[PDB]
From a paper:
[name] is a maltosyl transferase that transfers maltose from a maltose-1-phosphate (maltose-1P) donor to α-(1–4) glucan chains. [name] is essential for M. tuberculosis and its depletion leads to pleiotropic stress effects and eventually cell death. [name] is proposed to catalyse the transfer of maltosyl units to α-glucan chains through a double-displacement reaction in which an aspartate residue acts as a nucleophile forming an β-maltosyl-enzyme intermediate, while a glutamate residue is thought to protonate the phosphate and deprotonate the acceptor, acting like an acid/base catalytic residue16. Each of the protomers of [name] [name] contains 5 domains and 2 inserts that have been described extensively in the first reported [name] structure and therefore we will focus on the particular characteristics of [name] [name].
However, we could only obtain high-resolution crystals (~2.0 Å) when [name] was co-crystalized with maltose, maltohexaose or both. The maltohexaose and maltose co-crystallizations produced indistinguishable structures in which only maltose could be observed at the active site. The structure of M. thermoresistible [name] was solved by molecular replacement at 1.96 Å and refined with a final R-factor of 0.175 and Rfree of 0.203. From the maltose-bound structure, which is the highest resolution structure reported in this work, we can see that the donor substrate forms hydrogen bonds with the side chains of the highly conserved K283, N287 and S298 of the insert 1. K283 forms hydrogen bonds with the C3 and C4 hydroxyl groups and N287 with C2 hydroxyl group, all from the non-reducing glucose. The donor substrate further interacts with the side chains of the absolutely conserved Q343 and D378 of domain B, R411, D413, E442 and D498 of domain A and K552 and Y553 of insert 2. Two phosphate groups can also be seen bound to each of the chains sitting in a groove between domain N and the terminal α-helix of C. Two other phosphate groups sit in a positively charged patch formed by domains A and N of the two opposing protomers, near the active site. Interestingly all the phosphate groups are close to threonines, T98 for the first duo and T445 for the second. One of the threonines, T445 of domain A, sits close to the active site and within what could be the binding region of the acceptor substrate. This threonine is highly conserved in all mycobacteria species and even in closely related organisms.
Author numbering:
A (entry chain B): -1 to 63, 87 to 136, 145 to 696
B (entry chain A): -1 to 65, 88 to 136, 140 to 370, 375 to 696
The structure:
Amino acid sequence: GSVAGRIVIDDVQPVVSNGRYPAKAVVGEVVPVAATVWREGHDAVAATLVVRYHGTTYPDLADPPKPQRLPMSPGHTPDVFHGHFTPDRVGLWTYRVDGWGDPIASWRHNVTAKLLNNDLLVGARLLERAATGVPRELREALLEAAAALRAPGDPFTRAGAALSAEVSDLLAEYPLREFVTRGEQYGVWVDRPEARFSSWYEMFPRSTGGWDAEGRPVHGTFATAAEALPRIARMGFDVVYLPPIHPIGKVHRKGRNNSVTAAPGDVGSPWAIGSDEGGHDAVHPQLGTIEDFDEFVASARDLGLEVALDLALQCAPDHPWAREHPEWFTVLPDGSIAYAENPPKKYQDIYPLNFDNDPAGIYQEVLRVVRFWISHGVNIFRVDNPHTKPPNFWAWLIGQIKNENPDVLFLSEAFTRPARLYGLAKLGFTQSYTYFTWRTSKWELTEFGQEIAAKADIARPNLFVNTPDILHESLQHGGPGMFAIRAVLAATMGPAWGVYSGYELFENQPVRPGSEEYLNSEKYELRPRDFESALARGESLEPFLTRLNEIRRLHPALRELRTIRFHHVDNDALLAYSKFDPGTGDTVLVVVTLNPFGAEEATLWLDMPELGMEPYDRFWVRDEITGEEYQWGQANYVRLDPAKAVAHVLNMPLIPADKRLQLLRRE
Amino acid sequence: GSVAGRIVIDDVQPVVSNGRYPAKAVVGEVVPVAATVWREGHDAVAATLVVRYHGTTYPDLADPPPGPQRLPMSPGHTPDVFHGHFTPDRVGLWTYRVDGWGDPIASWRHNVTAKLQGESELNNDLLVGARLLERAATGVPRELREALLEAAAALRAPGDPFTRAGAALSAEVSDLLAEYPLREFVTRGEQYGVWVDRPEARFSSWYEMFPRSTGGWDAEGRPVHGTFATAAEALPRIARMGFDVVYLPPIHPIGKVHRKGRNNSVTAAPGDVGSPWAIGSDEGGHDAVHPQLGTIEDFDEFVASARDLGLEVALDLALQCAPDHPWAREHPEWFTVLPDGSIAYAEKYQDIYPLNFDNDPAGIYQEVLRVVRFWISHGVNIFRVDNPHTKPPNFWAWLIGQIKNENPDVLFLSEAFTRPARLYGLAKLGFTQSYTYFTWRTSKWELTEFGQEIAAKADIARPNLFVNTPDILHESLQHGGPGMFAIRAVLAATMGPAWGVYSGYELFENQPVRPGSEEYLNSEKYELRPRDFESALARGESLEPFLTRLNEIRRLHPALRELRTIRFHHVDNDALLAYSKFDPGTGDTVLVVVTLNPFGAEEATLWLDMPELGMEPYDRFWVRDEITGEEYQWGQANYVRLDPAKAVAHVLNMPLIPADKRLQLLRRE
Ligand SMILES: OC[C@H]1O[C@H](O[C@H]2[C@H](O)[C@@H](O)[C@@H](O)O[C@@H]2CO)[C@H](O)[C@@H](O)[C@@H]1O
Ligand SMILES: OC[C@H]1O[C@H](O[C@H]2[C@H](O)[C@@H](O)[C@@H](O)O[C@@H]2CO)[C@H](O)[C@@H](O)[C@@H]1O
Ligand SMILES: [Cl-]
Ligand SMILES: [Cl-]
Ligand code: NA
Ligand code: NA
Ligand code: NA
Ligand code: NA
Ligand code: NA
Ligand code: NA
Ligand code: NA
Ligand code: NA
Ligand code: NA
Ligand code: NA
Ligand code: NA
Ligand code: NA
Ligand code: NA
Ligand code: NA
Ligand code: NA
Ligand code: NA
Ligand code: NA
Ligand code: NA
Ligand code: NA
């Protein structure tokens, strides 16, 4: 939406909730901008994209308790202008569309249609006026063209210089602009590249302790956890995500397999935060000290990994806050506090917090906890169920944190209805968990991929193949082939993707039939794993996960969300989609089977202009999985055998600069 | 759009260009409002629609040159979306705001009913409920609190939970809470505008006629130049046909310099009348009447004659000049003067100069304003504006703004046959109605897309569907015979809440100037065209009775006033089209089945979208045909046949839609 002046500017994009929230982008991302710009008559109109960097000041998005002048090109959609900008630093960037009348282009159209004396002299006065705004060293071309128009003779000779590409190119750089109408200014918050493009590996530090001589698991420490990091870095992951590392409640502790009663020696859930040993600003005594955690962070950094900590705003009954601050809880008429819930899920080991009784106290206390972890080198937080806490609290918290350190990122674990999922992303959550795991059919995956592309300005997905809470029925019944299928889908549809430890060992047993919970869930017991022995035996997905991360690093098309395009493949068990990088022209096409058992074949009909080609063009592709090279065209035979490869991940011909910016247009 | 507080409100509709322009409505129209409203957890959320009337102050919708009712909103079937509505009862600026709030009593009533478990388990919930009723009672007048206070004591009394929760769940307590709800964390949304015009802005039937062609003929068979007196005598038959707006081409003196001759000839012959759009001569300009029409007093008698017949007058507003118009002599600053001293003609329009609004904006703006106010002072409350897309957009916003602030009942129809961004852009800037691409939409797929687009744009533009204009004799009408004239009139009158006919359409005038042209042969724009409508009617060679019946059907069915309720229904024949509309106010429902083939019979099964008609797929019902009188028993799948020699359409009166279903069918998302 825009402004109405002598020139009209309308339906400007990207604009979120009418300008209530900034759009999202990352450093080095090409941001497309569209605007409808119009005026009266057959007269030429043009637009300028005005871009400015505002520094690292981050806005408060909820109620608590030198600029660049860039050209805009007219599109094939009449009256729509398109531009783009590539932010080169973290912070708040703004853009504005300025509309203007282009008198010289109007003259050029009228004279060419006519090919006259009056029109020719009018042209001369326009070029003379244009020259007053051109540098002294470049004026001549315009002045000489004006003199020719004025001179007597044939109209074709007279208008020759004025209609030339030399004059046209000079004016494209220094235009004679009339009735300059200033559009509304819209914000884009620009984060570091990891906000969009990152590979996550989730692991429990307590499970890194191995076993004793009797095969009994030994509780890991920050020292053993640090030794488990080189293989994760070798697989190409750059974020190590840890469940909560604080002391675990001793009161109402859960036992093995989500049992309401713990037996002696039972470790309990890391999400039951707090005991007499400390709360959210303490480390679990069996893991080590805060100094041992600092050494774990330094080890992760030396391996090129960064740590993401779980931020769980809840308390075990023995957490220090449960005695020191009863106002932070909902006390029932009988004096008791009800255990936390997320229907149908029950959390008997914890109390939910109340943010309404004493907002100032609890806001400052959570801010203190987050600031504490940031000072210990944590710049990423995975936030549990943000949709169960007040939405204005998250906006306040993210705002306070980003104003002190703009590189701190937050991942929203909100498995909720779309309005709240995207609403939380609008309020400042860097990344969001999605419905990925439950999208298994060709139709579901097509709709899912098209939706993440369409929501690119609002939310960044993080596609986890599995989590400690999610072992999908598809992985339970599909064997190793299905493990490979889901990893291809997440790594190529998701610029951010994730794997929870054990996925590479094909762990597929649920607690009971019809459940999505893992049998002997690591949430309630030590789960050491011998990854090196499974690797040695050829029984690991570790080499394949490594290959997927290498393909991602080699192909910048895989950092993109908005460039996803699905191609027609005449088989319900086959899915095909491409992505491109508007920055380099890098293009990737994925052909993946959804059948993990038998072979699948079909004819793949490519949407050639989306690949920057003509229907009868023939071209070479290289499969990044096998190294096999094929010559393809508009219609190609495809065959996938899950025993050899579950997908082709093809390096496609580069899309030229002119074509890639056009294919990036919004409308 | 919205806000984020303790409650979040998002994606509010109707909102035009992010709030830059007000949405459109008319007096008596049900306006639907939607908003996404959400909070944390499983706790209930509710919303209130806050409506205010601001009077007739009209906003300036562009930068000119330097020179409260609390209405309940219902949760919908779409999760997190709330739906409301308001019916403005008077002309002017209305605003609405969505207020979101936590609803603790709805959360309590749900949790308690689910458990209702024994007394020991429910005890805490029953006691929480008692505290909620007391919090609610504080916002209730002292004389009404009793029921809430008694229900709270009963919740605390020992005994069976059913007996304790009884009074708390009673209708009497529930009704009181509906009047004075306990609202927590009230979050106030953004205020959005709705400009409300008189009903004619949406629902009106237009007839275009040239006053000069109402003079008839002399004894030699030569046309006689009509006057305002003969034009008034041509109004009774227009009123009997059921039109309520008579649209006149310009009524001012016509230019003598470069006057166009018959059939768009660049040179006029002595005695040639010229184009009415070549405004102005030494006899006067835009504030003058053509001397052959009569005086300004004869025009006043013409407007009085129109009013007494139930018609209102729409004058053509053409911002351009013949070379001999007073302005071209007195104000050269209002034109683009070329280097040789001449002024180029408008664009091909050789008989006129276009105006320049940029040289002296203050002078020309004030002069156009004086001219428009002059015609309003003579009883003109509607202006049909020529090619507004050729004049600066901020000029229109300023002019409509100045006029409507003084005279809010003045309406403007935009004749902008241009690209969508400018056509809809001018509607957003204030044009009451807009001409459309209607005439060029002839196939089933073009007409389906057309109807769905006009329904999607209802908050921003109101169409006026002319079957023909003096500039457009469509090829479909040139080759389709009388049957096609009847088909296009059904489509325009049933799809368009505003529609129009240009004089001569009822005589089936179908001859173009040359093959491949949309210009009429012997165009009334360049010559006098008297027509003997009475003799054609007596010979049964007129569409006059059919146009009368179409306007009668429109008056009888309020569903035909509507734009947003059009729904197309599947019919198995490429030459048949079917669509319904309903009125959310009364439940009046109409279904049209029309043939696009004027030559032969066409049949098919019509497959109704039964929920869209407030019915179940298995339902059976009666319909009445407004064209023939025939009644039929229908279901979900119905056999239909149209023989254009008998009737080109069925216009069916459908069963009334019940009140709850019709507001639900009006929902935005
Ligand atoms: O100890 C509390 C609770 O922890 C786990 O639930 C977590 C979940 O695993 C996380 O992904 C997070 O997002 O929120 C939940 C609540 O903290 C256990 O699954 C659960 O049994 C246990 O009670
Ligand atoms: O005399 C000027 C011009 O008048 C007619 O064109 C009109 C047209 O009929 C109207 O519908 C209006 O919207 O704008 C046009 C310009 O005023 C004639 O068609 C044309 O030949 C003539 O030059
Ligand atoms: Cl934020
Ligand atoms: Cl007439
Ligand atoms: Na704007
Ligand atoms: Na991009
Ligand atoms: Na646009
Ligand atoms: Na233009
Ligand atoms: Na334009
Ligand atoms: Na990136
Ligand atoms: Na809060
Ligand atoms: Na990707
Ligand atoms: Na709002
Ligand atoms: Na909404
Ligand atoms: Na109580
Ligand atoms: Na003078
Ligand atoms: Na006309
Ligand atoms: Na016919
Ligand atoms: Na004509
Ligand atoms: Na005619
Ligand atoms: Na004719
Ligand atoms: Na007549
Ligand atoms: Na309407």
